[PDB]
Amino acid sequence: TCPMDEKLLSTVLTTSYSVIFIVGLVGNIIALYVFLGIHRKRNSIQIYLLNVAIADLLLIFCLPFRIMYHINQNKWTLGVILCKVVGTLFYMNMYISIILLGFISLDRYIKINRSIQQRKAITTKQSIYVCCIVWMLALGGFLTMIILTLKKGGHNSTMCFHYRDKHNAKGEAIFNFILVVMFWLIFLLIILSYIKIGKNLLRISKRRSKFPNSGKYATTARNSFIVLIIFTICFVPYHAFRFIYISSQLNVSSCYWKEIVHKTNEIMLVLSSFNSCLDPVMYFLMSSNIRKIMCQLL
Ligand SMILES: CCCCCCCC/C=C\CCCCCCCC(=O)OC[C@@H](COCC)OP(=O)(O)OC[C@H](N)C(=O)O
């Protein structure tokens, strides 16, 4: 290996992940309470948000093991089993979050731009179907990768999450390439969905047929682009560098490349978990009723 100094990396990762842990924990607990407590009835969007809250709660649950490993001595005291379990559950949660984000955007685009009257709220059915399908497929992929790693591989060690070349497991390289291309497709769908939502609300505000509360359309138009840009800044960096990460991880290379690649990936993961901790606060603020509840309570 090439052991370059990483005390500053350890400190920044520990503090960032601890802040993300506390913020995402409080955000996701309050979000779960407001999705099961004060929402006796659920809509498709509320179902998808509840599942994003669950996925993110599991990501904040994954965080403390990462902070322990990074702060203790940058050494992994537990077995290779727990290493692979946490390292796989984290990515499982991230890509479940991203798929559910895409699904919310798609339903908002079918609800806002093209819906003329309503849908008679028959949407919770296929909402629960799609959420259960995606969760089961994600459990399938997570267990597949964890069993293909724990037994088929020959390499286990006493340190975790560190940079390891995937020449020992090319299946993981191809799995990550598949995941990156599908994330870019999902983000293309999100960008189409939210751009079209903003444009439709902008034109409707431009006509302004009915004078009363015609400005709420401006607020919603800004909110569409806000959530698109937050998702764009919190995810596109990581998945844009991941192509270079895979390309470097499956060829002969010097170590100096390896330190910069590893530390870039650490910062990008800090960003990704930052999104997973923001999203509940985003739903708290963007909803009129919840924002009024918070403002009158605070
Ligand atoms: C329609 C098909 C969609 C397919 C996915 C279904 C939903 C998603 C379900 C769960 C993802 C499971 C984890 C996948 C891991 C991909 C990323 C990756 O390569 O992580 C590797 C793990 C180690 O895994 C064993 C080889 O990395 P770590 O060692 O935990 O961290 C190393 C490094 N810090 C890094 O993360 O690059």
Residue numbers in the entry: 45 to 342
From the primary publication:
GPR34 is a recently identified G-protein coupled receptor, which has an immunomodulatory role and recognizes lysophosphatidylserine (LysoPS) as a putative ligand. Here, we report two cryo-electron microscopy (cryo-EM) structures of human GPR34-Gi complex bound to an sn-3 LysoPS derivative and the potent M1 agonist. GPR34 adopts the canonical GPCR topology of a heptahelical transmembrane bundle (7TM), with an extracellular N-terminus, three extracellular loops (ECLs), three intracellular loops (ICLs), and a short amphipathic helix 8 (H8) oriented parallel to the membrane. The ligand-binding pocket of GPR34 extends from the centre of ECL2 to the middle of TM4–5, forming an ~25-Å cleft that is laterally open toward the membrane.
S3E-LysoPS is an analogue of sn-3-type 18:1 LysoPS, with an ethoxy group at the sn-1 position. Local refinement with the mask of the receptor improved local resolution of the extracellular half of the receptor, and the resulting cryo-EM maps allowed modelling of the entire complexes, including agonists. S3E-LysoPS fits into this cleft, oblique to the receptor. The head group and the acyl chain of S3E-LysoPS fit within the hydrophilic and hydrophobic pockets, respectively. The head group of S3E-LysoPS fits into the pocket, with a U-shaped conformation. The phosphate group engages in electrostatic interactions with the positively charged residues, R1102.60, R208ECL2, and K210ECL2, but does not form direct interactions, such as hydrogen bonds. Moreover, the carboxylate of the serine moiety forms a direct salt bridge with R2866.55 and hydrogen bonds with Y1353.33 and N3097.35. The amine group forms an electrostatic interaction with E3107.36 and a hydrogen bond with the backbone carbonyl group of F205ECL2. The acyl chain of S3E-LysoPS is bent at the cis-9 double bond and fits along the L-shaped pocket. Moreover, R2866.55A mutation abolishes agonist response, whereas alanine mutations of R208ECL2, N3097.35, and E3107.36 reduced potency by ~10–30-fold.
